[PDB]
Design a protein around this ligand. Sequence first.
Ligand SMILES: O=P(O)(O)O[C@H]1[C@H](OP(=O)(O)O)[C@@H](OP(=O)(O)O)[C@H](OP(=O)(O)O)[C@@H](OP(=O)(O)O)[C@H]1OP(=O)(O)O
Ligand SMILES: [Mg+2]
Ligand SMILES: [Zn+2]
Ligand SMILES: [Zn+2]
Ligand SMILES: [Zn+2]
Lengths: 55, 255, 45, 268, 242
Amino acid sequence: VAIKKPKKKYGTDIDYNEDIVYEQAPMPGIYDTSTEDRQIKKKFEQFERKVNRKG
Amino acid sequence: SWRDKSAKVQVKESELPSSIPAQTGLTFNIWYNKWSQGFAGNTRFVSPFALQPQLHSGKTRGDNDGQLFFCLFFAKGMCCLGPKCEYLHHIPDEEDIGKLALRTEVLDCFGREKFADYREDMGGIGSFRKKNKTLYVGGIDGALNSKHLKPAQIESRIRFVFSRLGDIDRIRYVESKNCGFVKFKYQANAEFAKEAMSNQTLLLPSDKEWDDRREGTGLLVKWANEDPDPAAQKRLQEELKLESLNMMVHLINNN
Amino acid sequence: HHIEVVSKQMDPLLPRFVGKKARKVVAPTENDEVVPVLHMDPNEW
Amino acid sequence: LPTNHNKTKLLKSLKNTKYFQQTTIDWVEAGLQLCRQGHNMLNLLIHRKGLTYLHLDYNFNLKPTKTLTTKERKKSRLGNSFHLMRELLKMMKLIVDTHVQFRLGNVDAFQLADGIHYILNHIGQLTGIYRYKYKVMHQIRACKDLKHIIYYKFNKNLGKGPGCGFWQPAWRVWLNFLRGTIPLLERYIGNLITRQFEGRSNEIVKTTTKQRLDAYYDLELRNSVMDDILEMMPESIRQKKARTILQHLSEAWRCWKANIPWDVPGMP
Amino acid sequence: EPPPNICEQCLGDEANIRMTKIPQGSECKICTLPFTLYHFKTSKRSNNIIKTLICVRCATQRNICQCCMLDSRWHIPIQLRDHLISLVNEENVMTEEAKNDMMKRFLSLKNVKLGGAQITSDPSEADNIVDKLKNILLRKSFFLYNIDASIPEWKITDTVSQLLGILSLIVNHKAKCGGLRFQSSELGERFVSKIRGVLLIDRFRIFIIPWSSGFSAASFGTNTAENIKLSLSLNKLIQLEL
RNA sequence: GUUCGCGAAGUAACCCUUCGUGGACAUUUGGUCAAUUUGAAACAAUACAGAGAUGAUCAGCAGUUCCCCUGCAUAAGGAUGAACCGUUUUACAAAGAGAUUU
RNA sequence: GUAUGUCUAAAGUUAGCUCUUAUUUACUAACAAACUAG
Ligand SMILES: O=P(O)(O)O[C@H]1[C@H](OP(=O)(O)O)[C@@H](OP(=O)(O)O)[C@H](OP(=O)(O)O)[C@@H](OP(=O)(O)O)[C@H]1OP(=O)(O)O
Ligand SMILES: [Mg+2]
Ligand SMILES: [Zn+2]
Ligand SMILES: [Zn+2]
Ligand SMILES: [Zn+2]
């Protein structure tokens, strides 16, 4: 059984786990990007597995 | 078959129950058509009407008008105008869903509007983002009127019930959580079965509780999530990649 | 598709704009180009 | 002076749609249907808000079914608009119900005319429109004044008693009242119904009435002084100090109110 | 006031199509902001009325049309074209769909083409990823054994129906076993005539058994701990066949 | 169905009727919308507390808000309408002195 | 005593020191000798 989420106090209440809270990715610059987004996603997924086993 | 005959009057106009719900409050709110000043006792109920496909299928005005949106009250089993209903009063077959190929990812097979994502209850109409085919089937406790059964018999009853409603991919009743997961060949068959077994019962007429059929609260057919074991994620990813390779061939043939 | 667009006669009793609704919206302040901020140029305070 | 380019009317703008339809019915049927439809519309205005305990009676008396909370007294109060609708429909239902008590065969035509002249000269007693719109009292006084003329030209050789039913000029006075408060009720109920469907405009910004000379004058002078210090002070990025220098300002103002010399050691 | 994105498949095979604009029609089904809604009919005498269900900014953020909710260039779903772009560029281009209301409004008002919309937007990179796609494609009851979990029930009905001329069926996927059932005496004789023989669906081999017992789903197992164990034992029995 | 023109029968009958034919009058509605749950109203039912300055009892007006409600409202009211208090480390240096590895 | 706030499965999402004990003092109570709230 998973955890309750807190009640929507108002009809447009924001739940801050599903999405980015407000997507404000930086303005595109002249340098290439994806080679370190891969490192970020790999390190984040390893942190996800580590929280799955240690927390 | 059903292409030969005409569709039957499943219920008279006078033989419908009233739109005023069961009294769950003090006074009747005629804007939202509901009850207020109190909330004790379930709004939910066992539906009095079932589908019975092989008897009540047939050819309506909707075949003459060329429309291929199905009938939400055929699936509930509660149409008054049987052969004159504008929608279709038969099971969604392969050719009808094939003519639904232009609009079934926007609307469902009843003409209802698919929303952004699911509800918090995961039950309703559905999304235009998931090509959702698997139906969660809960609420089996009151659907049996809390009768002690083995899980294989309940799985057999759910298999025989949802075999009436189109082509089946895969059914798996969960013994530990008392729920099924009925996956279909098409999305429209899943939509039609969700409307079809909405709040009915798994009770057979061969059992003693057939007079007290409409006592508890019936089934709970809802849209299901992904199947979180990695084997079904594996079969999902490889079937999606094979359908993507088919669409690769289509995009190369187009341009 | 050469299309004639025909705005219908709405019902005069209904809400003329049923999509119109009170809602609070946060608009993104996007940055298309980075704007220069140019400022060319102790104990008493 | 009336507007000269008013080619648009109300009903002439509703004939030209596909929704309204022309027919010929009895006046009493039209009155009974406007009573039924007014009851349905006010009942739906009540029931959309969730005020299901306000049993709007068929004679348009709003009565709470049970005694209330305060939360069920805040949502269940309504403005001059809804109640003004309710009182004009009380008035019209009294009119149409006296014509019905005629048409049913119960009451005489003379007793109909006296009943109507009783309605149109006791709107302030039978109905209650004087509460929610007080310039109705003008018309109510005029109706009383017309009563005071007509009962002493109808009763020269008759003395005192009921029976007078020359209801024409009081009827004119209430029709001129309705001539005045058609567009009033159009704007009021347009704002109410768009609050019910569209909702409250979220940028309600409050104009400075006589409760807010002090607070908004404080915000005025405080923003002015803080802009003056931020102009004067060199190269300081504001995080915390911008909040605190103004305290000296308010300190000085209390030092001005106490007539104490505002001497602070180390101020520039 | 931008004109709508409605592709050639929603409007249909007509040249003169009369649509109806309603300014501020309804909330769009992505961001719940109101917009000018265009509803029409594909023919003049069509029974189905087809309306735009998303606003113009949500259409151009996904490079999709407003009616059939598929791609403007390719007429395919958003999830699958994002999957195809992930197959091409080796980069998981996914469409980040919102779930909070304020996030929906925020994510629609910004000037960007999110997801895989930028690739299919201009036709140059569209045909670039198209010939990359071409480069990728250059590179009376019965019992049933040997049903891997990627074999549905409807394919087992369809192949048996195709080998005959056209009857229910019961398959325990967690036990990886199958069964078939009908009533006609001659239908079983014709099933024997059109053959432990092998059913070949998609080269995946399914062995048949004339099952004289009347099987229920309890015959395939009563529990889930029986199903996996019987599947392992029956795969070892298949190795005993081999 | 109404009318105009023609032919054929009753009929070797310019009266009338029937049958057959060409034309004209008349020309594409309605749906953003499906009839009880599963596309979302909120109050009320239970139980407990029971108000912002602090030693108490309070009048308030404000501000921020990706909180709204009642209100015709740019008035007014909603406890000063409610949440506000919570965490709290780097635009980080320079001089001088001694104790340590080489 | 209000405003107002908070809680409430019917529906199952797939693997010095330690101590007992009494007196005093302070703040609180719609608790008592038919009614009083921002
Ligand atoms: O109390 P009075 O000074 O004697 O006047 C009354 C009174 O008229 P006012 O409204 O001016 O006071 C009555 O009105 P209501 O009591 O009903 O409000 C009215 O009776 P009706 O309105 O029922 O006709 C009656 O007039 P009358 O009895 O002659 O019909 C009239 O008496 P006066 O004629 O002597 O002024
Ligand atoms: Mg107060
Ligand atoms: Zn029907
Ligand atoms: Zn949108
Ligand atoms: Zn389209």
